[PDB]
Write an enzyme that holds these catalytic residues in place. Structure first.
Site, PDB file in Angstrom:
ATOM      1  N   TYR A  60       0.849  -1.198   0.000  1.00 44.08           N
ATOM      2  CA  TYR A  60       0.000   0.000   0.000  1.00 44.08           C
ATOM      3  C   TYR A  60       0.888   1.253   0.000  1.00 44.08           C
ATOM      4  O   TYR A  60       1.803   1.356   0.818  1.00 44.08           O
ATOM      5  CB  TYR A  60      -0.840  -0.066   1.271  1.00 44.08           C
ATOM      6  CG  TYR A  60      -1.963   0.945   1.382  1.00 44.08           C
ATOM      7  CD1 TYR A  60      -3.148   0.775   0.675  1.00 44.08           C
ATOM      8  CD2 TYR A  60      -1.898   1.977   2.306  1.00 44.08           C
ATOM      9  CE1 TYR A  60      -4.236   1.632   0.873  1.00 44.08           C
ATOM     10  CE2 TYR A  60      -2.964   2.857   2.485  1.00 44.08           C
ATOM     11  CZ  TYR A  60      -4.119   2.688   1.758  1.00 44.08           C
ATOM     12  OH  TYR A  60      -5.157   3.586   1.974  1.00 44.08           O
ATOM     13  N   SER A 133       3.912  -6.793   2.156  1.00 46.29           N
ATOM     14  CA  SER A 133       2.764  -6.243   2.888  1.00 46.29           C
ATOM     15  C   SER A 133       1.446  -6.568   2.179  1.00 46.29           C
ATOM     16  O   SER A 133       1.204  -7.765   2.012  1.00 46.29           O
ATOM     17  CB  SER A 133       3.001  -4.757   3.150  1.00 46.29           C
ATOM     18  OG  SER A 133       2.169  -4.373   4.231  1.00 46.29           O
ATOM     19  N   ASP A 179       8.015  -5.455  13.372  1.00 47.15           N
ATOM     20  CA  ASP A 179       7.050  -4.850  12.473  1.00 47.15           C
ATOM     21  C   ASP A 179       5.886  -4.245  13.277  1.00 47.15           C
ATOM     22  O   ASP A 179       5.262  -4.939  14.090  1.00 47.15           O
ATOM     23  CB  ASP A 179       6.525  -5.939  11.513  1.00 47.15           C
ATOM     24  CG  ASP A 179       5.828  -5.395  10.288  1.00 47.15           C
ATOM     25  OD1 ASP A 179       5.160  -4.329  10.400  1.00 47.15           O
ATOM     26  OD2 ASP A 179       5.911  -6.056   9.210  1.00 47.15           O
ATOM     27  N   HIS A 210       9.059  -3.187   9.387  1.00 46.95           N
ATOM     28  CA  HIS A 210       8.194  -3.627   8.291  1.00 46.95           C
ATOM     29  C   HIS A 210       8.915  -3.658   6.927  1.00 46.95           C
ATOM     30  O   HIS A 210       8.483  -4.373   6.026  1.00 46.95           O
ATOM     31  CB  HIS A 210       6.999  -2.659   8.219  1.00 46.95           C
ATOM     32  CG  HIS A 210       5.946  -3.050   7.231  1.00 46.95           C
ATOM     33  ND1 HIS A 210       5.300  -4.263   7.313  1.00 46.95           N
ATOM     34  CD2 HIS A 210       5.418  -2.330   6.214  1.00 46.95           C
ATOM     35  CE1 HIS A 210       4.399  -4.256   6.329  1.00 46.95           C
ATOM     36  NE2 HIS A 210       4.438  -3.107   5.644  1.00 46.95           N
TER      37      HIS A 210
HETATM   38 CL   LIG Z   1       0.609  -2.608   2.774  1.00 42.08          CL
END
Ligand SMILES: [Cl-]
Length: 266
Positions: A60, A133, A179, A210
């Site tokens: 994202y 992710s 994360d 992350h």
């Molecule tokens: Cl994401």
């Protein structure tokens, strides 16, 4: 009998930890991307035969730059890799999965296009998925919807649902210990624990944020060794990579290691 998919020299820890493998890599931008935003294709020269294809999707708000280090790294070991930008940086995991599969279909179309640099270079029956992710959740959705895929290796995955119990594709989950975006205890580890029907692995990077497996990370030797070994073992059925793919690295860079149905090289 000779494995028809085995490519390249016999692996060593040093060759797999290096910034590049044995094959020279070239790349091109996909002129008219179909079903996704943009793509860059990385491919090896004279791999010794047709090779598998891998499609990699960012998370994202993110673009190809965040995951592009995998392109040359995997291609230099004998794979055709496509890194993509999504139609919108705000696309959710199911949309990322649709775009990832559209990218693999375009690599298969380019394999059959005489003007393409990858004409006749791909074995379109052997494909894999990777991503970060939401792109990691998208890779797991691609594997659940397309059991014909040969390997998956998402990093710091996230999805609303952590239930991937139907997945039969060999799946390596890279996780990042610290994360705070897709926490391991509510994303990567429950996703790993849900899968009881496949060869699988969980590799958690010690102190990792992350972004611990994205471009520019400080563990490219280990992460790159594991990603290439996993794709070699499962996309090429290459038992020269069984130990590298299935072993516990026994490394201070790893805070948690788990694996199932992953035998070392006999
Ligand atoms: Cl994401």
């Amino acid at each position: 009998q000779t494995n028809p998919y085995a490519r390249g020299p016999n692996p060593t820890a040093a060759s797999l930890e290096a910034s590049a493998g044995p094959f020279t890599v070239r790349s091109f931008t996909v002129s008219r991307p179909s079903g996704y935003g943009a793509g860059t294709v990385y491919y090896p020269t004279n791999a010794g035969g047709t090779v598998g294809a891998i499609a990699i999707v960012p998370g994202y708000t993110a673009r190809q730059s965040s995951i592009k280090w995998w392109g040359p790294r995997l291609a230099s070991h004998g794979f055709v890799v496509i890194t993509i930008d999504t139609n919108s940086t705000l696309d959710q995991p199911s949309s990322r999965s649709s775009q990832q599969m559209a990218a693999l279909r375009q690599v298969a179309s380019l394999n059959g296009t005489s003007s393409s640099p990858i004409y006749g270079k791909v074995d379109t029956a052997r494909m894999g998925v990777m991503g970060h992710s939401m792109g990691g959740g998208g890779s797991l959705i691609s594997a659940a919807n397309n059991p014909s895929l040969k390997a998956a290796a998402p990093q710091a995955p996230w999805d609303s649902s952590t239930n991937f119990s139907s997945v039969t594709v060999p799946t390596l989950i890279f996780a990042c210990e610290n994360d705070s975006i897709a926490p391991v205890n509510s994303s990567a580890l429950p996703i790993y624990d849900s899968m009881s029907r496949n060869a699988k692995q969980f590799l958690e990077i010690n102190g990792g944020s992350h972004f611990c497996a994205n471009s520019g990370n400080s563990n490219q030797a280990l992460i790159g060794k594991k990603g290439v070994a996993w794709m070699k073992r499962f996309m090429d059925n290459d038992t020269r990579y069984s130990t590298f793919a299935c072993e516990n690295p026994n490394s201070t860079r790893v805070s948690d290691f788990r694996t199932a149905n992953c035998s070392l090289e006999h």
